[PDB]
Amino acid sequence: NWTEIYPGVWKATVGKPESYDLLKAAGAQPNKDALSKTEKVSFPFANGGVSLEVSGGKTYLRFPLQKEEQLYGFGLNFQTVHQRGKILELHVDHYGGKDSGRTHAPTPFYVSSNGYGVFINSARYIKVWAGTGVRKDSENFPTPKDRNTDKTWSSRPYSDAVEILVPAEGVEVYVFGGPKPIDAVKRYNLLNGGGYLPPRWGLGFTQRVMTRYTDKDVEKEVNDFKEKGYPLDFVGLEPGWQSKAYPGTFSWDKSRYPDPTSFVKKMKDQGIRLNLWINPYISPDAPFYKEIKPYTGSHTVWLGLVPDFTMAEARKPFFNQLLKDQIERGVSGYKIDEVDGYDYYLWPDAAKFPSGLSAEQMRQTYGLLVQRYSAELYKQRNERTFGLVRASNGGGTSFPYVIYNDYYNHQDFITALINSGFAGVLWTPEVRASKSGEEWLRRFQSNVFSPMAMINAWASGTKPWSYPEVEADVKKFALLRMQMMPYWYSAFARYHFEGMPPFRGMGLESKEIKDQYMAGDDLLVAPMFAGEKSRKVVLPKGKWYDFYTGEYAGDGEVLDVTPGLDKIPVYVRDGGIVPMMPALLNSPKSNQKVDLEIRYYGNKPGEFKLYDDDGETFNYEKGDFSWRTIRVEKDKSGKVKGSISAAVKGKVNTVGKVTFTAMTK
């Protein structure tokens, strides 16, 4: 039976569900308050066609489709956005170059253009036929045709249902109502706890440095950023911070980092946090090796033991070491690597774990487990974190981690950014290296319109300025990222409080758009790729304005755009507002006031909700935050008129002088 458990959210338990699943793995708590404020819409399957059966050891699910209907989601796909007519096996893995279901976050959640969603809460590998099955007993069974004589014969006849097979004796299913597709995604994300509310520093620039860097190499690089006037908030350390890697000791190397306490402190005194690479695979020389060994799996990954993080006995030594040796020294967060695949690196499905959890469910949830328990260490200290993880799944919306990978096709990197919005996870299209300055800049441009502005120079040793032909423009985009901080912070606040993904596909206010995305509420981003001089941009109905000049761009039409090397095509909705702080090189501290220039586009009266709090603790959970409403219009003369609501008594206020600019002359 379908229980309406929240407004627009229904739960069904089919057969006998397993005692481990995605939500339980994640320890994900629904945001009940946010959910209760959503509209109480009706059940999206109102005309039958739903079937939930257990048979022969498996759970068979069927959901009807209508002729008009398109589907989105099924996780972090890289080459496809429309999912109807697709066949997948959802399976955590490093992306393999095709959308098979093998990917870093194979979220078993899909959304329909008719305005609903469905989440299958199983930590098993799941098979999906998204409208390919043609049932003899179907109400829409097409009329058989004779291929010998009939030109209209079809090799893929009409299918009227999504079919899912779960290899278990039952499953929990969740259905999310609309009325719009984005409504279903928001409710799904709120069921997961909402997005994490990141620290402001997490939205600044991060440079990861070569594996070999010593503490002195890092200090010099920090100094070079400062000297050249490039922003930087956190530095990523790669495997050479550890005394051994692959497998790891999770202790600082004595030669390269002889005094970690002093090193972390110095960086912090200069405004610089550190984010440490780990994979979770245990060296014999790790200090907690002997203690953890019985609570590890049968199989190793690069000769490291694999902790069973479902066991307290594995968690305690592992996470105590991170806590005592790094977090308590000031380390801001982690890059949780190599928790996805490939199959020939990670443990086989044939492996055994001491808790008795199947290796399959462990593969599906390992990234969730390491995200969960690492994040808790920070939350216990009233400190936000923000980091990187190479695997996640359903249940992982609330974690402070962004997905990245070693794939590099730029176009597909943007497609994954789109799909991240359907998958309850964050994705960054990171910058590593490039064969040209052109490509470097194009990549850097799209990267600063994403969750995390980052160069990963683990092997390349690149810095933002490494391509002289484009360095002046790279600097400009790096500074823009800082200036847009209040815009991004407010978008991320919406993700946390309302489940609104900050990056998402078009049409989420009939043909597939794989190369444009909305960034926050106000910006349509249409990346250029190396070797292109122009591109088409599909604009939704309503007027849009050029992000750079404020000039009218179009309304419900296709544009041909030749932006030049120095611009990424970005368009602002009519009445859209981007609050801009100064081009600071470091995120502003909680006790700091920052001036804002409110850039207002078009002529429709605009409204923007600016989020404000200390930007670094969990004090917001106790109500120490504010939303400042900004409204902007042009008066009779065409002169800008703006207001900002009053600061709230007793709350953090980081808003300084506020000025308004009508961008559309």
Q: Does 513 bind its own copies (CB under 8 A)?
A: no
- Cβ proximity to its own copies, 144 vs 650, nearer residue: 144
Q: Does 135 bind its own copies (CB under 8 A)?
A: yes
Q: Does 603 bind its own copies (CB under 8 A)?
A: no
Out of 7, 27, 133, 354, the only residue in the binding site for its own copies (CB under 8 A) is 133
Alpha carbon distance 292, 461 (integer Å): 35
DSSP letters spanning 151-186: TT--SS----EEEEEESSSEEEEEEE--SSHHHHHH
Q: Give least dist CB 129 to its own copies, A.
A: 5
Find out whether 556 and 539 touch, Cβ atoms under 8 Å.
yes
Name the token pair of 154: 């079809």
Sign (positive/negative) of CA torsion 238, 242, 244, 247?
negative
Q: Give least dist CB 401 to its own copies, A.
A: 24
**H-only helix segments in 435-537:** 437-448, 471-483, 485-498
- Going residue by residue from 37 to 66, which x/- string records binding to its own copies, judged by CB under 8 A? ------------------xxx--x-x----
In 10 A of CB 435, how many CB atoms? 8
Out of 24, 82, 84, 127, the only residue in the binding site for its own copies (CB under 8 A) is 127
- Cβ proximity to its own copies, 49 vs 507, nearer residue: 49
Q: Which stretch binds its own copies (CB under 8 A): 309-317, 337-345, 510-518, 587-595?
A: 337-345
Q: Does 25 bind its own copies (CB under 8 A)?
A: no
Cis before residue 157, ω within 30 degrees of 0? no
Residue in 105, 52, 636 with CA at minimum distance from that of residue 422: 105
Name the 3-class secondary structure at 419.
Answer: helix
Out of 189, 332, 358, 365, the only residue in the binding site for its own copies (CB under 8 A) is 358
Residues from 241 through 260 that contact its own copies (CB under 8 A)? 242, 244-247, 253
Q: Give least dist CB 159 to its own copies, A.
A: 9
- Cβ proximity to its own copies, 48 vs 56, nearer residue: 56
For the chain, report the end-to-end CA distance as a whole number of angstroms: 58
Q: Give least dist CB 343 to its own copies, A.
A: 5
Q: Give least dist CB 177 to its own copies, A.
A: 25
Q: Does 139 bind its own copies (CB under 8 A)?
A: no
Out of 1, 143, 591, 637, the only residue in the binding site for its own copies (CB under 8 A) is 143
Residue in 571, 410, 484 with CA at minimum distance from that of residue 204: 484
Out of 13, 114, 132, 460, the only residue in the binding site for its own copies (CB under 8 A) is 132
Residue in 279, 253, 257 with CA at minimum distance from that of residue 266: 257
Residues from 202 through 221 that contact its own copies (CB under 8 A)? 211
Residue in 459, 455, 444 with CA at minimum distance from that of residue 566: 444
Out of 67, 151, 156, 541, the only residue in the binding site for its own copies (CB under 8 A) is 156
In 10 A of CB 659, how many CB atoms? 12
Q: Give least dist CB 587 to its own copies, A.
A: 31
Out of 15, 30, 157, 287, the only residue in the binding site for its own copies (CB under 8 A) is 157
The DSSP H or E segment spanning 118 is strand 116-121
Out of 31, 80, 296, 398, the only residue in the binding site for its own copies (CB under 8 A) is 296
Find out whether 94 and 406 touch, Cβ atoms under 8 Å.
yes
Out of 258, 284, 605, 656, the only residue in the binding site for its own copies (CB under 8 A) is 284
Q: Give least dist CB 647 to its own copies, A.
A: 51
- Cβ proximity to its own copies, 166 vs 662, nearer residue: 166
Name the token pair of 57: 């050891």
- CA-to-CA separations, 499 to 89, 215, 375, in angstroms, rounded: 26, 39, 19
| b/e sequence 137-167, b meaning 16+ C-beta within 10 Å | eeebeeeeeeeeeeeeeeeeeebbbbbbebe
DSSP letters spanning 432-444: ---SSHHHHHHHH
Residues from 70 through 99 that contact its own copies (CB under 8 A)? 85, 87
Q: Which stretch binds its own copies (CB under 8 A): 152-160, 320-328, 469-477, 481-489?
A: 152-160
The count of residues interacting with its own copies (CB under 8 A) is 62
- Cβ proximity to its own copies, 46 vs 344, nearer residue: 344
Alpha carbon distance 540, 559 (integer Å): 11
Residues from 532 through 591 that contact its own copies (CB under 8 A)? none
The contact set with its own copies (CB under 8 A) reads 55-57, 60, 62, 85, 87, 127, 129, 132-137, 141-148, 153, 155-157, 163-165, 167, 211, 239-240, 242, 244-247, 253, 283-284, 296-300, 302-305, 343-345, 347-352, 356, 358
